[PDB]
Amino acid sequence: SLQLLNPKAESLRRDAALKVNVTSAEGLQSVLETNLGPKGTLKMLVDGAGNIKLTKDGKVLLTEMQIQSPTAVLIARAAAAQDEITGDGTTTVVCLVGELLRQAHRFIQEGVHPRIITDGFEIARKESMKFLDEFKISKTNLSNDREFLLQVARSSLLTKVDADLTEVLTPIVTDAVLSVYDAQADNLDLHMVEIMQMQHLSPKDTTFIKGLVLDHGGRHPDMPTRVKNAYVLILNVSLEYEKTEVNSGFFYSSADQRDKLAASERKFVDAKLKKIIDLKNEVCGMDPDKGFVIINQKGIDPMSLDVFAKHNILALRRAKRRNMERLQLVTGGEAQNSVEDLSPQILGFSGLVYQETIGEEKFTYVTENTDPKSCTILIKGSTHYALAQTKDAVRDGLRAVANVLKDKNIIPGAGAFYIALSRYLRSANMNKLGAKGKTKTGIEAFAEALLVIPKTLVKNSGFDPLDVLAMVEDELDDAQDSDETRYVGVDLNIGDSCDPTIEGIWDSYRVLRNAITGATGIASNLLLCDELLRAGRS
Amino acid sequence: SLRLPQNPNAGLFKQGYNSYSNADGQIIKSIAAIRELHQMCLTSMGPCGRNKIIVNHLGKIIITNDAATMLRELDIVHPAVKVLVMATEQQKIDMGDGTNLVMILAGELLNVSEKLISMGLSAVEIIQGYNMARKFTLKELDEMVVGEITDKNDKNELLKMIKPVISSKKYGSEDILSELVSEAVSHVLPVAQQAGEIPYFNVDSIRVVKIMGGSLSNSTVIKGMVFNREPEGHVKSLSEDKKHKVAVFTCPLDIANTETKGTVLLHNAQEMLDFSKGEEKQIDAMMKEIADMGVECIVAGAGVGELALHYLNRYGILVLKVPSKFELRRLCRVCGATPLPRLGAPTPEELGLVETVKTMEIGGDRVTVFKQEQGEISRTSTIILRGATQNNLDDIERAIDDGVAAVKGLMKPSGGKLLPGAGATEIELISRITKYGERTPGLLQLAIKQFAVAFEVVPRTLAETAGLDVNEVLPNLYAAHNVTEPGAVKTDHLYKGVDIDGESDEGVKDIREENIYDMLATKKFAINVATEAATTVLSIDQIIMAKK
Amino acid sequence: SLRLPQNPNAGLFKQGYNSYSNADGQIIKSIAAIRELHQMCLTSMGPCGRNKIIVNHLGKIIITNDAATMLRELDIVHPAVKVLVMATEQQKIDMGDGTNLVMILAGELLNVSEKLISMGLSAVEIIQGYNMARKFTLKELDEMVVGEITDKNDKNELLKMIKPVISSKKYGSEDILSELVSEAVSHVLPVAQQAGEIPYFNVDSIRVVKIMGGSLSNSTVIKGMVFNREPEGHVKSLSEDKKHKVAVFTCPLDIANTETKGTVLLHNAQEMLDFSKGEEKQIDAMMKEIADMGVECIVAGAGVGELALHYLNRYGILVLKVPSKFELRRLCRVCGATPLPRLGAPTPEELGLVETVKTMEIGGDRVTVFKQEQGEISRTSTIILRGATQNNLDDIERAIDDGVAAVKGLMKPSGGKLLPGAGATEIELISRITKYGERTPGLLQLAIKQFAVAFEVVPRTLAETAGLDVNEVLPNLYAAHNVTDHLYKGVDIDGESDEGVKDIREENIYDMLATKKFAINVATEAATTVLSIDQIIMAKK
């Protein structure tokens, strides 16, 4: 009846619309099916502009490649938002939504109504939350165990890269999150850790630095490159040509006044420079061994760079806005806007300050701090896409480790959480559950859809997913009567099971809780949609 | 039956998106796509290598045999080829040496990988085979090193370093090109032996000036920088000697103007009569303090007004125009001067020293001579390059830069660490990795043994480009390495290498007399980049392209 | 999200195929599509009905109110309309009467089902509702017949059958058109004391020859046939010969030749002199035996050569071509002769008798008159129409064809009897179907009640086409049946219709019982098919 409302319109409903959500989610999951797992495939994206994106992250595949199917747009926006808050779960939600639609599609063909199927998803998901309390293992932060943070960080590293880059980046991420933990217990992920792309040597040479690194360096040659003891002065005021306010200007009566009025431009610049000189007069003690540096947020007039050169003062201009907030954490001083009020207390402290000039760009390195409150991670790579591959690998590992210190609990990985829900939902009495009759069927579709992820891990290893899970179910049968509580994982190397606690495979708590909650709402709204149409004024 | 289903549910992505996976022979097509541009750089390898012509969209022609330079102007399509293209560019930036080796070695690792994949080796086991074999390769390079450069500067020792590097790029005459580069290096070295200071070198210090006409034998080395400029007021040979005092001003010479609304204000005719003579006394008072200091030359960084050029011709002061920045920055390093923005009297301690400034006709235009002399040495010397064609002038400039980059390799490491040349470095690694492949049990020995087979391209390429049969010459070279080591020490068989033309039959005796060697610091990064370039291609199971 | 998935079934079948299935459309949608053509037939129903002009791609214009004729020349893309079109075609071929009733009744059965489907009643139980209601309708039509007549002979008995049919089509003429058909039927029927065993009757016994010009009142009835031809060789002898023997020859008149192609073979010139007089005396021998038998008229279907026409002109023997074979057997029934393909000589038993033959111009063109008075004719007649326009006489011929079709439907079975007209029968069927639903409880009561509602369209169409209110005259008609005199109440078309009651026996407007039985069975089955088709499959172009 839509052809009578609009002259030209396209619509698909009932069985036509039922094949929309099932088939479109099947093709999207197949792209990320080979992605899941540390042995998963590696994809490269090349656009028409010539850029190259090489990563195993499923979020880059969704953002770079456009999707014409509206069904996957709902999944792409759900998989993207999962990586935003939890830093993980992009490819997990896609495998959950795509499979749960197919597992529930078989009963839709049998005549079961979609609503009573989606009603069983909420009943089965609320049990995963009650089971999550007994499934999680508590970890006390008072022990300050470094080995625990090493095994958790390797979960995301072994997936994106191999063991070569994992062994290098494992202590780097651990040393980065070590300074994040404080007596205040507050964890701030953005200011504590950054990703700076620089092409030097090989990607495997990436090293950790305990102090802030900047993209700027001294423009004047006489500026000291290496300063033993430098006092960092934070200046957010810029010395340079101003907007001048509509450009009123000067009017000189005689040629002697023309040059007399030209000296007024340096009157305002030298006015703020005398305050810096007066501040240097307090720290003048041990001047040859010590030093004084200036870091400005905005560009500095090259006319005034010669003033800092005679005093051997390193000047840095056009610095980032976020870098100004971290100068108090690295050096330990305070920020100063107006130069009228200056004190030695706001001055920072650094044990080593040096600059390494590579090519046309110059970088400034700061390290050796008494009590540094923040650190950095210097990302080195061979190629442009190599800088992005490490950027996506380290950043995804940041939220994984940071979420561990937020709560007191940790979730074991290796498919131990998905297999445990299968035996729990199938063996649970339905009288305890609020679902009865045909709603009992919808719960079985949710439990069977969770077993594909541990089978998807095996598909990348070449082993038969059906035969490798036969030994997992047989181990959990005798474990209940033997008075032994042990979690059974999946080892893809030998094609047998394993223990995630002994092997060191752990997963974040916030990732799986938001993934199942997010994937359930997507698949439920798609099963409840019986018609898909397109209309609008263009 | 008439029309295919045409891949149902393909509307998930745009029609321009294509999916290519390791299955269906696309990983073989990717390796076959490398061989298209691989054979292009094979004929360019070695001293007998052939240069290539590449015409861009703007019409500029760059004739060079360097793999890193040729791949810049070429438009690449296949994604995995860009992995090989960007791998050769990093080798040219970092070490400035061994660019053709990264292109050839990374391409041969994929050629031998085609047989490895056909036998059923997974992509994971192939990567682990090259990583374990490369770690053993880097350890054997330090064991096979012979000799050292020792002292920084020597007349003879610089002929064992820059000369074998520039022999592959525009071979021509040997001693002619080696003396021009080796002379400019000795000037930029601080020397100062026994002082214990940290050595320093700049790759951008030596500048090559391209001047058409003449011949290569007429080229020379100039201690100062050479520009094409026409003096404004007058030309002066400055035969009165006693050197000179020179000052450099990065700011232009003119009356200081207000940055906002510069305007002449005259209230009455009394101020108008003295306005014309007022500006003349300003430049006179400012330029008088410079002439009183004995400054015969002034370097300007921007346009200078005519009123300022008048008083400069009164005292006989030369005028130089230095546009942009980098051109003026290297001028002060020659004379040892410190620029200052003001027009006042410069500081006597910041004044430079240049004995003579000459203007003569070289390529038909007036050039200014900043050349220094024995005393009061200068840095950032320039090399005048004469040639009949401009195309040869471009690659020789890059050939000299390859020799300048070789000097940088004498600073950061502990020494030069010379390696046997003529392909003897990659050949000795074949017998060592072969023994290493047997010492490792398991299925990983297949990728390790084939990793040493990829090193056979260096002797085969040098023999093929020399007009010799690779079937007769190559097996005859293994006869020296098949006898291993005798019951006595002092074995010189490690100096055997591949010969170009001549009498063939191996030859050149021991390369120790030929003096051609290789750099160890170059071979370290040349193998690492070439291995990661082929590893990246083999680590990608699926390739996706857009719009095409 | 810009482009749709296009569905996986798009690759299945072809893009030219279109699908209309349950919940996919149709379901009182397609029923609303036929309402455009249904309203076309509603305005053409009754004596006040409106004719419709239809221009075929060939350019011929057919102006008639007959639904079977209108839907035949119209090209209709909608397939389910053809179910109703082919339903009206059966009514014209077999019975020939009631084509407008089938299209209107079947169209309303789909309209009353709009409320049934909207209430959730499945189409399976709807079919069973109309089938059980159709069986009860046919059983109640026998008790309402007061017009049973055993005569079927006298001319005044046809005023209750042929005349009511003519009243609807070309209502401007009543006694003029009824006299033309009633007199033609009296001629084709044999004269006998008692004729039993269902004497044979066909639609070919009465014919219509349309002549341009002249008023319709000037028309008359001719026992013979009127064809447009050119006589040759002589003027007729009028009544001087009285009854003359007419010989109808199938083969042309000429010297008999073989089917294969022959030619003349002359060896010597002696046979050349006898070749001229040979063909003259050869055909003259066969033409001489015809004149000896007293045959004044010879009809040869094929072309007659000049050599045969030469001899027949001097003896005064008429020659008529009659090119068409269909009209050749019609002249044989006038004289009562036997068509003879052989030439030979005419036998007395195989020759017919014609009283007189004349050539006159009715409309300005010369035609031959076969009219035979005092003679014996069997199942032959004609009706000469006079009109100013050709299109107006087209529907008049169809009105005559529908008038003689009622005689065929009356004579062939045991009888057609009579039924009260002018909305008298349709209202009585409403009270029968309504009370029938309350006798048997069940879910079929919804389909039975709506089955009686569709009967309200016929009596109100007479009031609607008369410029009357269906909310006054029609409701007052049901109160007139409250209670013989209550079965004769009907719809009145006149300025005196304000009372809404006119006796049917006054004007004697009756309908055939066998016509209504055949019209309901076709209309019910036609509406049953539309509701029994769940999915529609189309094709490209």
Ligand SMILES: Nc1ncnc2c1ncn2[C@@H]1O[C@H](COP(=O)(O)OP(=O)(O)O)[C@@H](O)[C@H]1O
């Ligand atoms: N080396 C491994 N061995 C076994 N299981 C692993 C291994 N690495 C990752 N996994 C499993 O793969 C799942 C997905 O991990 P990851 O790729 O980090 O998240 P996502 O797939 O959401 O990007 C985890 O639940 C984890 O249990």
Ligand SMILES: Nc1ncnc2c1ncn2[C@@H]1O[C@H](COP(=O)(O)OP(=O)(O)O)[C@@H](O)[C@H]1O
């Ligand atoms: N005259 C010669 N005889 C034998 N071998 C030579 C001769 N000249 C150069 N070679 C060898 O050929 C190789 C060419 O190196 P190449 O790939 O051209 O370096 P680059 O790319 O940095 O110019 C050198 O390693 C050198 O050992």
Ligand SMILES: Nc1ncnc2c1ncn2[C@@H]1O[C@H](COP(=O)(O)OP(=O)(O)O)[C@@H](O)[C@H]1O
């Ligand atoms: N003069 C008249 N007065 C009242 N009713 C009439 C008159 N003429 C015709 N009718 C009615 O109009 C109806 C027309 O029906 P018609 O279309 O002829 O039926 P069918 O389709 O069987 O030929 C008849 O039933 C008849 O009763």
Ligand SMILES: [Mg+2]
């Ligand atoms: Mg992850």
Ligand SMILES: [Mg+2]
């Ligand atoms: Mg070289």
Ligand SMILES: [Mg+2]
């Ligand atoms: Mg009629």
